[PDB]
Amino acid sequence: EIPLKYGATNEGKRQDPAMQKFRDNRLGAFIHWGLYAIPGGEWNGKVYGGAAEWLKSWAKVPADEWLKLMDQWNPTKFDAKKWAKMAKEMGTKYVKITTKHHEGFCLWPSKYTKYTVANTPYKRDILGELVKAYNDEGIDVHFYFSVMDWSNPDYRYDIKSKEDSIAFSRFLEFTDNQLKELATRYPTVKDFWFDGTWDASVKKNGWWTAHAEQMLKELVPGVAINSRLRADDKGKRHFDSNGRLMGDYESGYERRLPDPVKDLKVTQWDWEACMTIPENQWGYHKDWSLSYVKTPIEVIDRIVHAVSMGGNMVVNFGPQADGDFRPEEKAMATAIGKWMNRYGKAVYACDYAGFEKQDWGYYTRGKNDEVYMVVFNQPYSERLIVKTPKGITVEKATLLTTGEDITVVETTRNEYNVSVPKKNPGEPYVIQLKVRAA
Numbered sequence: 001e002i003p004l005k006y007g008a009t010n011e012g013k014r015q016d017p018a019m020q021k022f023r024d025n026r027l028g029a030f031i032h033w034g035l036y037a038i039p040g041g042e043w044n045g046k047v048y049g050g051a052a053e054w055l056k057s058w059a060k061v062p063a064d065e066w067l068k069l070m071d072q073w074n075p076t077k078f079d080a081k082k083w084a085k086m087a088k089e090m091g092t093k094y095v096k097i098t099t100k101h102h103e104g105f106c107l108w109p110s111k112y113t114k115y116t117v118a119n120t121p122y123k124r125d126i127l128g129e130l131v132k133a134y135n136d137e138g139i140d141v142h143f144y145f146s147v148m149d150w151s152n153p154d155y156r157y158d159i160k161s162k163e164d165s166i167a168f169s170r171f172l173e174f175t176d177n178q179l180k181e182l183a184t185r186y187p188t189v190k191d192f193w194f195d196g197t198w199d200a201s202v203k204k205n206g207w208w209t210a211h212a213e214q215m216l217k218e219l220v221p222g223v224a225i226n227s228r229l230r231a232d233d234k235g236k237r238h239f240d241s242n243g244r245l246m247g248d249y250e251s252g253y254e255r256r257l258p259d260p261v262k263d264l265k266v267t268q269w270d271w272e273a274c275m276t277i278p279e280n281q282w283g284y285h286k287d288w289s290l291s292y293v294k295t296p297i298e299v300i301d302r303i304v305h306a307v308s309m310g311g312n313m314v315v316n317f318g319p320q321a322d323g324d325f326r327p328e329e330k331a332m333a334t335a336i337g338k339w340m341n342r343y344g345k346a347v348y349a350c351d352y353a354g355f356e357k358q359d360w361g362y363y364t365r366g367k368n369d370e371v372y373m374v375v376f377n378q379p380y381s382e383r384l385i386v387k388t389p390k391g392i393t394v395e396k397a398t399l400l401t402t403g404e405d406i407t408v409v410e411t412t413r414n415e416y417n418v419s420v421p422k423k424n425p426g427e428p429y430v431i432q433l434k435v436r437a438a
């Protein structure tokens, strides 16, 4: 048992109302919007296949020159109420917003740097307007923040000297000032999601990560903080050197979700996956033909998969420079919202059901012991196998959308065949089980 000043703070899941709301939300959207939306992955006639929000790096653009993009920041089609409506229709319960990405351009009028929205033709506090607009739709708002900041010369990747070390303290101070500003200007914020905390400079200053979490929790009651912020005394990140989760929930599973058979350990803590629609574009990139683009059913599968394992899923959007959304993204949000509007009773406020995974899809459990079968792979057998845990029996099955009764047959001791519906629903669909325990 290694002793640590800056390791894990929670032991187990938070059960306060604010974390319960975080959890019960389940479905969110991510907004990556920044100066990178203007060049859209293209610099001086070259289209880069890398993530558009890292274009500064790929095209080796100097900061002075990258930040001059502020002169072009004027999203005349931007309308916060329209964004909030789109989110509401999609069925999202929260939105995570890049307040500042690695480039260091702030979407709120920070007084601690001139690289902000206030110094652009558009002038307006984009972040403030989104906060209000989402909140008026009853949508929670979470703040992405990049500690790594390519706009501030005090930033260091490592500390190799007194001069580094001095510069970096000033950088941490600046960072604290920005975070305080965010927390006080936008007091309805429910979460800070840190990024760009993997450099040796940050790993060598875990104390700062614990301080940042504490400071923010003091300023914003109930706020959630992600694991990626956090490094312990030994520089170990996400989980401390005793294997205990730091922050309030695990943030990962960006490429791959936990395996539904081998990774059941995740059910023991809150966690949240965030995904891109293309393979790896978060900011707006003009050419989506460069990588595979997920269809709505692929995305819905991922959303349900996360909830079936006690996790939230967040779907990313990279708005256009003009302040509108590209057609693929509007289509995606609409598809998802139609599906959520028929089947969201099996997503919202649901969790791990404790049933052995089957090939036809996923189980989720409702707040009142409902067990939902979410079918993504329709068996030619027309039989959906359900293997119950010891002492559990299935008393009824019902098609969620129509209420029709669905036949359940016991095949052996802890096992049933739940028939598919009389008419193929033609999309992923839900059957609700009434189950009874000894």
Ligand SMILES: COc1ccc([C@@H]2N[C@@H](C)[C@@H](O)[C@H]2O)cc1
Pocket: 051, 053, 054, 195, 274, 282
């Ligand atoms: C493997 O290196 C990285 C570094 C930064 C990222 C950033 N985290 C995502 C959520 C976006 O903000 C992306 O640019 C992704 C991968």
